[PDB]
Design an enzyme around this catalytic site. Sequence first.
Site, PDB file in Angstrom:
ATOM      1  N   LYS A   1      25.802  45.781  46.234  1.00 47.12           N
ATOM      2  CA  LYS A   1      26.143  45.832  44.811  1.00 47.12           C
ATOM      3  C   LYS A   1      26.606  44.463  44.321  1.00 47.12           C
ATOM      4  O   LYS A   1      26.160  43.986  43.279  1.00 47.12           O
ATOM      5  CB  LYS A   1      27.230  46.886  44.547  1.00 47.12           C
ATOM      6  CG  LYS A   1      27.699  46.998  43.091  1.00 47.12           C
ATOM      7  CD  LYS A   1      28.775  45.957  42.740  1.00 47.12           C
ATOM      8  CE  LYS A   1      30.041  46.118  43.596  1.00 47.12           C
ATOM      9  NZ  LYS A   1      30.772  47.401  43.324  1.00 47.12           N
TER      10      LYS A   1
ATOM     11  N   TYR B   1      32.536  53.925  37.252  1.00 51.92           N
ATOM     12  CA  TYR B   1      32.319  52.511  37.548  1.00 51.92           C
ATOM     13  C   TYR B   1      30.933  52.214  38.136  1.00 51.92           C
ATOM     14  O   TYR B   1      30.344  51.174  37.845  1.00 51.92           O
ATOM     15  CB  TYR B   1      33.443  51.937  38.432  1.00 51.92           C
ATOM     16  CG  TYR B   1      33.275  52.155  39.917  1.00 51.92           C
ATOM     17  CD1 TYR B   1      32.684  51.186  40.714  1.00 51.92           C
ATOM     18  CD2 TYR B   1      33.716  53.323  40.524  1.00 51.92           C
ATOM     19  CE1 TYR B   1      32.530  51.374  42.081  1.00 51.92           C
ATOM     20  CE2 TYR B   1      33.574  53.520  41.890  1.00 51.92           C
ATOM     21  CZ  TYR B   1      32.980  52.541  42.664  1.00 51.92           C
ATOM     22  OH  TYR B   1      32.826  52.732  44.025  1.00 51.92           O
TER      23      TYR B   1
ATOM     24  N   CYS C   1      29.666  51.156  52.112  1.00 51.46           N
ATOM     25  CA  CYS C   1      29.959  49.836  51.561  1.00 51.46           C
ATOM     26  C   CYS C   1      28.954  48.759  51.988  1.00 51.46           C
ATOM     27  O   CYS C   1      28.374  48.071  51.154  1.00 51.46           O
ATOM     28  CB  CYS C   1      31.383  49.397  51.920  1.00 51.46           C
ATOM     29  SG  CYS C   1      31.868  47.867  51.091  1.00 51.46           S
TER      30      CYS C   1
ATOM     31  N   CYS D   1      29.455  48.434  48.160  1.00 54.85           N
ATOM     32  CA  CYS D   1      30.119  47.189  47.788  1.00 54.85           C
ATOM     33  C   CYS D   1      29.263  45.934  48.001  1.00 54.85           C
ATOM     34  O   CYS D   1      29.063  45.153  47.082  1.00 54.85           O
ATOM     35  CB  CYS D   1      31.436  47.030  48.570  1.00 54.85           C
ATOM     36  SG  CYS D   1      32.192  48.566  49.190  1.00 54.85           S
TER      37      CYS D   1
ATOM     38  N   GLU E   1      28.292  49.612  36.513  1.00 51.27           N
ATOM     39  CA  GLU E   1      27.838  48.464  37.289  1.00 51.27           C
ATOM     40  C   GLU E   1      26.318  48.428  37.364  1.00 51.27           C
ATOM     41  O   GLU E   1      25.704  47.379  37.182  1.00 51.27           O
ATOM     42  CB  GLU E   1      28.471  48.481  38.688  1.00 51.27           C
ATOM     43  CG  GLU E   1      29.974  48.193  38.659  1.00 51.27           C
ATOM     44  CD  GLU E   1      30.620  48.188  40.036  1.00 51.27           C
ATOM     45  OE1 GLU E   1      29.978  48.632  41.009  1.00 51.27           O
ATOM     46  OE2 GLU E   1      31.782  47.745  40.143  1.00 51.27           O
TER      47      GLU E   1
ATOM     48  N   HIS F   1      47.177  26.041  33.742  1.00 48.11           N
ATOM     49  CA  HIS F   1      46.445  25.723  32.518  1.00 48.11           C
ATOM     50  C   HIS F   1      45.378  24.675  32.805  1.00 48.11           C
ATOM     51  O   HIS F   1      45.626  23.734  33.556  1.00 48.11           O
ATOM     52  CB  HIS F   1      47.443  25.197  31.479  1.00 48.11           C
ATOM     53  CG  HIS F   1      46.835  24.868  30.147  1.00 48.11           C
ATOM     54  ND1 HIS F   1      46.359  25.835  29.285  1.00 48.11           N
ATOM     55  CD2 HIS F   1      46.657  23.681  29.521  1.00 48.11           C
ATOM     56  CE1 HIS F   1      45.899  25.254  28.189  1.00 48.11           C
ATOM     57  NE2 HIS F   1      46.069  23.948  28.306  1.00 48.11           N
TER      58      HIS F   1
ATOM     59  N   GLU G   1      46.638  32.507  33.093  1.00 43.59           N
ATOM     60  CA  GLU G   1      47.932  32.132  32.530  1.00 43.59           C
ATOM     61  C   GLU G   1      48.381  33.061  31.399  1.00 43.59           C
ATOM     62  O   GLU G   1      49.568  33.173  31.126  1.00 43.59           O
ATOM     63  CB  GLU G   1      47.916  30.679  32.039  1.00 43.59           C
ATOM     64  CG  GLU G   1      46.883  30.409  30.946  1.00 43.59           C
ATOM     65  CD  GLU G   1      46.963  28.992  30.403  1.00 43.59           C
ATOM     66  OE1 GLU G   1      48.088  28.510  30.145  1.00 43.59           O
ATOM     67  OE2 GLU G   1      45.900  28.359  30.236  1.00 43.59           O
TER      68      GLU G   1
END
Lengths: 461, 461
Positions: free
Chosen positions: B49, B180, B41, B46, B184, B450, B455
């Site tokens: 990246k 993934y 990572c 992670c 990415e 909002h 929402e």
Amino acid sequence: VASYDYLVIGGGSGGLASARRAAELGARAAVVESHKLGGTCVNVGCVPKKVMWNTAVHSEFMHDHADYGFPSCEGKFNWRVIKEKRDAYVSRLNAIYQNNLTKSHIEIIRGHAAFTSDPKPTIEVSGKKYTAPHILIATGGMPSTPHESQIPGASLGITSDGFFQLEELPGRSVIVGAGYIAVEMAGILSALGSKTSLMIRHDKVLRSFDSMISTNCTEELENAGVEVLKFSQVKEVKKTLSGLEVSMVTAVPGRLPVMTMIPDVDCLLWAIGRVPNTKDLSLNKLGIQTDDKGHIIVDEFQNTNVKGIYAVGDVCGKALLTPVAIAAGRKLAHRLFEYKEDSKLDYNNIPTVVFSHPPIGTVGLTEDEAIHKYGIENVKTYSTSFTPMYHAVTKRKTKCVMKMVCANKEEKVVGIHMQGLGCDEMLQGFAVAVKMGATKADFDNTVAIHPTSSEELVTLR
Amino acid sequence: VASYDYLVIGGGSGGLASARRAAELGARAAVVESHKLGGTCVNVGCVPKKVMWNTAVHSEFMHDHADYGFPSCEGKFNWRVIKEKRDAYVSRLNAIYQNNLTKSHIEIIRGHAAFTSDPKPTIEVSGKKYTAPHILIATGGMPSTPHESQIPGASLGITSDGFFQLEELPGRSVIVGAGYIAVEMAGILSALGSKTSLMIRHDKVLRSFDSMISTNCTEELENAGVEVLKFSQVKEVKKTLSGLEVSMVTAVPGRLPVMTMIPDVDCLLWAIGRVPNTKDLSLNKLGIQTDDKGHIIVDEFQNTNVKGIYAVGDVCGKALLTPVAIAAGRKLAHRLFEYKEDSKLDYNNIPTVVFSHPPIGTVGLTEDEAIHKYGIENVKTYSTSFTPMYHAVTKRKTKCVMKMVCANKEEKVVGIHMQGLGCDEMLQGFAVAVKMGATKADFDNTVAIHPTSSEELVTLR
Ligand SMILES: Cc1cc2nc3c(=O)[nH]c(=O)nc-3n(C[C@H](O)[C@H](O)[C@H](O)COP(=O)(O)OP(=O)(O)OC[C@H]3O[C@@H](n4cnc5c(N)ncnc54)[C@H](O)[C@@H]3O)c2cc1C
Ligand SMILES: Cc1cc2nc3c(=O)[nH]c(=O)nc-3n(C[C@H](O)[C@H](O)[C@H](O)COP(=O)(O)OP(=O)(O)OC[C@H]3O[C@@H](n4cnc5c(N)ncnc54)[C@H](O)[C@@H]3O)c2cc1C
Ligand SMILES: Cn1c2cccc(=O)c-2nc2ccccc21
């Protein structure tokens, strides 16, 4: 007199939502609107504000281009370009909300409504009368401005309304107020290049928010180039050759009061409160109850003191937010037209975002509110402060602050407060959890998402 | 032989977290690490990246400058600038994790560990032996590359490891894989100006994700200029004058197989899977059980088949995420050193974000998974698709798609899936709610924030 099941005064957030939901339940409904459908939020509120915030956000991130290996940009921001597109977008929205009504078979009554003295609740618009067993007042409010009697020249200042009429970026801006609208306005004008001051009555903005937010937001405003004029208020405004002169009095505790003239102000913006829109409703003709500010008084079911008459939204002066007017409006529709007697809005744990830089997210009780409600011995707060890894490579910095307020042995999460990148989109899910009565173990039992800022809320210690 | 309470093999996500928590509970612990602390990572995962994603995000938003009233930018992105800063940040992190261990009074053993044949579980590092009643294997994995025997020239391609050694932006990039990491990588290289292809075995990427996400993500990749080479795989790679030639076979259903030569490829990147790091552990000396891929087999408490030996994280091949290794590691520490016999990680409802453009957020069951588990008659999904108002003023568009998967009469939310702006920071709170067993009424009873994208998840109908 034309009769309906439901007469709704105001085609804004609360009115539209309530009429539309009523109509779904079969109600023959009409909406009265004197101006543009969508009301404050669509026309001079949430929507145009957010577009301007997005614009300001671009300006902020642009400072980081070179840090991220990109060439620097060319110079001149052009307010007129974004204003025109913002306007067009608002126009598209108006057309959409008009269509929503028509397709719902809701009649649109154009004009200003006022009640009549007629025994059974009846309104008049442009000489024509309309009645219903159920009348919703959803007229919203409007920006407050000081009286000339109190502050000579105040009428030279504008409000958020005027803000959305601006055709150019003011060279020099003074915003007066300390609430979320003031903060958002100052943040936007400053990010876009206006030499900006924010004038507040005390030491920090957002004093009704958790103290961590109040403190952090004030600091971040200063870090971003907004001059925060503390313990200061306007005494007078004068038109000068170049623009406006703002005479202000500053009275910092432990110091002596001092008067300062602020020259060359292009834009003085009052953001010191909202007044309800009730003055010309002829409420007195039916003895409809208001407070001394003109807010319509309601019970928990949005009933006024008068049978068959209700009120929701800003006109009642509580939790002045679009989603709140909408939810109270829809709950009301369900009560009246689906006969759900228990249908009402829970005003606890309503989430709010303030679009400062970075954005603020809050839901539930401040630490002080929790302390007062549960007892200081029964409140435990967790908090963290970090620089988001977005800034790991930039010279410019913003902070992320998060506070979780827990109550009792189970450590029920009764408050979550935060400011930082992404916090605007981060809040909603946590608000669902808090509404559900999440405890801290619920958060801690949720696996983190890495690398994000949001994960910090589920790994507080 | 030096003895400890806890020997942890691997100073990555799972190892560090477990050792640190053990130490808090009083354990005399040591961490073995052959390379850099922080493991995959921090060093090649992670963190770097995300920095690269943030860079790519800048590039994407920059296209919108003129639309927002800003002057257009100058031209040349400089990979070298961001690489150096990324590297430095990784170095700061290494120093931090080293310090975390020392301040925790956790011994750091530098070198490659392997078990010995000694009766009681014992490891050797650089000729020295170490033992403990509790040994955690947290060695992680590494990128998979095809054998030359299967694909001649494959070794000419790099992996995500090599990606983080790149000193310049490849002019032409081919990424092979559909998971993934592939997505990415392609998204980042393409946003930053590489002429990018993503080669996948079927018709869509992320086929293990909800079908809405699989479909939307593939489409958004194409909209962003990534060439998605469907039903295609590499047959051979050759070094050419300008770079690499990639010979691929495409076999679309209903068509005939066709071989295509892709010339002038600067960067061929294999992202077709991860292999566990167990080959040189001498697992066989103790009969420690693995699968045919070399993953260490564990029960729900991370026990191997051998008493006193445990494994967590990528080395076990399940849910290869940093927060998962961390949580399993900490749960394990609590079980062993706080004697909490029930302490273990729940592998259900682990949230994931994919940093595509826009980002993907998912937690819980896909619609199909829910259908299989509950019965098609007992699943109800809600979904929406909209263009975020961020794009109300831009010529460039991205979509936001959201799906809520509900099961049974109560409409328990058993899945949430989404792609769109802000979805990376949006997911965490909803994951807490889903973990808590939220129903759709729980979402609907939560007042909206909002204007945000978030929402939309609490107002689905
Ligand atoms: C600058 C600014 C920014 C804001 N940003 C946000 C935000 O980001 N998020 C959020 O949740 N809220 C935001 N708000 C708050 C928000 O807009 C209000 O809470 C919302 O509009 C309230 O809904 P309402 O139905 O009560 O009143 P309104 O939406 O204002 O609608 C009331 C309507 O009634 C009409 N009317 C009034 N009297 C009569 C009459 N006698 N006869 C016929 N028609 C009449 C008006 O013309 C109007 O259209 C913002 C407000 C401002 C001023
Ligand atoms: C390109 C890429 C991007 C990623 N992005 C994300 C993301 O955005 N979010 C997320 O949650 N996950 C992400 N991951 C996943 C992630 O990094 C892993 O899931 C995580 O590192 C697993 O933790 P671990 O402790 O099991 O293994 P690791 O973190 O890899 O640590 C294992 C360690 O053991 C050491 N080691 C191995 N064998 C020995 C030995 N015999 N003796 C001594 N030391 C040894 C290694 O050198 C290493 O440091 C990404 C992975 C990759 C490759
Ligand atoms: C969220 N975000 C943005 C939002 C709105 C407008 C932007 O220009 C922008 N730029 C960014 C650059 C990097 C990382 C995030 C970013």
